[model samples]
Target chain A: KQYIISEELISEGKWVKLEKTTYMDPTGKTRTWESVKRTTRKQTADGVAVIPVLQRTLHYECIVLVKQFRPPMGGYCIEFPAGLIDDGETPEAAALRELEEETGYKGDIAECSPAVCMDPGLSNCTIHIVTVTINGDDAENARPKPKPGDGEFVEVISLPKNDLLQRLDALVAEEHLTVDARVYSYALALKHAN
Target chain B: KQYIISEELISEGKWVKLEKTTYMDPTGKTRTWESVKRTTRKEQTADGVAVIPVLQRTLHYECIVLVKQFRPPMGGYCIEFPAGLIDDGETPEAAALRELEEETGYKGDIAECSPAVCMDPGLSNCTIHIVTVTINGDDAENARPKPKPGDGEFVEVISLPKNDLLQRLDALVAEEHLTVDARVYSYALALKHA
Candidate 1:
């Protein structure tokens, strides 16, 4: 079986770091692999996301999402409201704050998924997906105000649950934006079932 | 207007690199964000492929394939769809087929493919294409499997009924004390709603 022999920190940045590891394989061979990690990760997770759903008994349930110009992505990206989990905060707490900050609407955590990694082959960054529910009829939500961090410009978007796949494709083509893997897979999951 | 001002390599490694980008937001505020990138990304935008392979014998006899193994990056075992990085000169389909066979010895046909999607756009510039693969469970290759992971790629194959995957994934994690991949979990989430 493959197992690690040793790992060394190759480089470190303020927020991220790179590590190189030497491991032994089943074939009795040793090799190296490069990995990335978030230096600022807390005990809970490196980040948290909110699957913010606004009740739409009037029509169809809608998902609250955000479109932001991600520097690393080189274009605007459609994604769920998400943010890094800060020190001394649980993933659920981080999701609550991130959702309100990014979407300008308050919500309740309906359920929390187990922590999962986004790009495990390249990094250790993990996040908790918190499914949240927002009351569409809430008075405060009528004029919701967002407070994203400085330079973190994001626009809130509400897309109907039934139209995620097609609408996301259309928006990406029209806006020249990328779709997050988790976000796209969510739509795919629905498609697979329906 | 929102635009990038500059980016500097904060750290460079053999396979991974860290950079800090300075950009002007929509509000005309300048800010910096740390990001990770792969040094070996090639012509294709997608760095890898995730095989969402489903084996079917009948309408109700459908099962999704997965792989579980220890990830040095995470220092924990992770459960995920059969996936692998691409070769420099190969197309995603070629890589997907080669990788799927090497990882689990399963021959499957690509049923559908998704556009390149980012795993952690906030952190890495890397992207992966999601490929849905269909396999005939009654095929001769299904009688006995050979997981021929390359050097340092030790993994165990897993199969779960397609219908109740989300529920099973959660219980599997608890039962085995393993981590879940976001791609796998997101698909399950969609299944729940579907």
Candidate 2:
């Protein structure tokens, strides 16, 4: 399945690695590209990553979001609950676990997109966009509280689904938040649909 | 506002590099992350994104254009928006136009564009500027888009009815066993904005 003829690790670090891959191009030409890979404990059997987008109905009706500082962005980013799938874990299970760990809320996976790649040109990572519905008794008790992972500082916030566009605008203009593409585009689509 | 204190290049190849970044987290804790980069001639490359090209030939008829290609990282084909890396000194708008022409071989006026957004903050330092383009013309002329391929780049241009976009995307995963990029998939969901 892989066109790569060989892959040699160039360097390794605690969290990532650099590798040189020799492969055949589409036209049958031999080529090489240096790739950066995240060192995982073990590759999940399904090789599916999960992003939990938690939505609930409050008096205001909102989507649960997380605000955390990303070193690459050099600022805080607004993103959905997301993480890598653990070995032997199903995507559904990972989504629920990530949702609770990142936002301190529990929800059920309503649906999932087909496995999706993050940056195809840059890396081989892929994720499943899992839609999570927070409803019933759990919705009321765990709605606004969040206890992020240890050593991780995250602010749990809610953006009214009806006013997401305006809220995002304010988040950008005033709060200087860097919105993740997946989150912003999802919000924009909802704005358009309404 | 840049928080990076030092960057050490771990390895370099023709297209990408491994770099280590030392920075201060918001909590005043020193942290380090190894990231992959798509090397460019410039120190700072313009943020890149994509356009979900919408062609409206008739007042009520519309179609969206997408590209299909094999991404080596995934070791499979990917369905995604027409995207490109911004060239040094090139505006995102200009890059979008250039990428559309090079990948899909159709032209349209830029209708809307979003601010730069990060893709994978933890793995890489890449940002994208999403744009929407509207092509106006006769039904027959606008419906067919001819792809102009470039340098060993194998691309299949697909133009589908705006309403059928989601269904086809679902089939891509269900039957074709292909992966869709997250941003493109997110916008596809957004297009359902009902």
Candidate 3:
């Protein structure tokens, strides 16, 4: 069995920080590793991604998405509605808040993942996959309005579930937006598992 | 609609560098974002590849291959898909097959390949391609090549049935304090859609 020994901060950024950590491998030899970390993370989680499905009926359902420009990506990225878990927040509360702010849709938490890490090799950034269900028949949801924060611009997109894979390709062709792998994987699943 | 304005180096490490980037939003507001970039970008399509190995067995139920390891970044153990950084001139598919064998001592063929996907987009430029690999589990247990891992790397392979994967993951988490990787949990959740 192996265990992490200690972590030392190498560089501090505005939101993210770099760390050089030491661990004892299964061979009982100590090794050093360089990793990235979020400065604002708590024991609850570092962040959360809201996977919302807009439903009017069984046959009329859509997947809610957000298009935002990611400077780290060097371009706009089409992604699930996501954000950090701030102020000692629960993943479910954060999901609802993020969905309303980023996509302008209020939804109910269908399920929340038992905390998950996105890329364990690179950073300690962990998130909870908050699955949400939005009733499109709701009066307030009929004409949604997003209220993004400062320095943020998000475009809400709702694509039908029947032709999601094709429509995503179409959007990527017309707008040249980078798609998040999590979303793309689910889309691929729709094709592979359907 | 908007783009990066400039990027300046804030700190440099052996494997990664921190950059303070300024970007102008479409609404004409410039924001400063701190992002990490890999020091080695040797013309590879993606920095790494993650393989979702589907083990097909005639006597046993079909399952997926997972690796359990102590991630220094998370300061705890995580159960994740088998993955490794791409070597120069090696196709992502080759890397996927290579890493899966190296970590799990099993051979597989690539079934599906997804586009390059971002990991920790808010913090790093790290991206990975996800490949679905098909492994024949009917082969003799000792027939496969032994895993080859570095002294610093210690991976424990686990095979879990595809049915009730979420409950199984949760049970493992409670029994062993292991966190599920997002890609794994998302895949399990996506199955519900189909």
Highest-DockQ candidate? 1
| Candidate 2: tens digits of C-alpha lDDT, residues A1-194 | 33778878888888777777777777779777666667774633223323443444456566777887776666678888777788878778888877777777777777777678888776777777777766624544454466666657777777776787678778889888788888887776665442
Model 2 regions more than 4 Å off: A41-58, A136-144, B1-3, B41-45, B137-144, B191-194
Look at candidate 1 and give me any clashing residue pairs. none
Q: How well docked is model 1, in DockQ terms? A: 0.70
Q: Across residues B1-194, which tens digit of lDDT does each residue of candidate 1 receive?
A: 56678889987887888888888777667888888888888887588898888888755558888999778787668999999888888888877777888888888898888888888988888888888888887888866878778866777888898788989998888796578999898888878876
Span of 10 residues, lowest total lDDT, candidate 3 chain B:
B142-151
DockQ of each: 0.70, 0.58, 0.68
TM-score of each: 0.94, 0.88, 0.95
iRMS for all predictions? 1.5, 2.5, 1.4
The C-alpha lDDT values of all candidates are: 0.84, 0.72, 0.84
Model 2 TM-score, 2 decimals: 0.88
The superposed Cα distance between candidate 1 and the true structure at residue B185, in angstroms, equals 0.8
Top lDDT hit: 1
Error of 2 at B71 (Å): 1.1
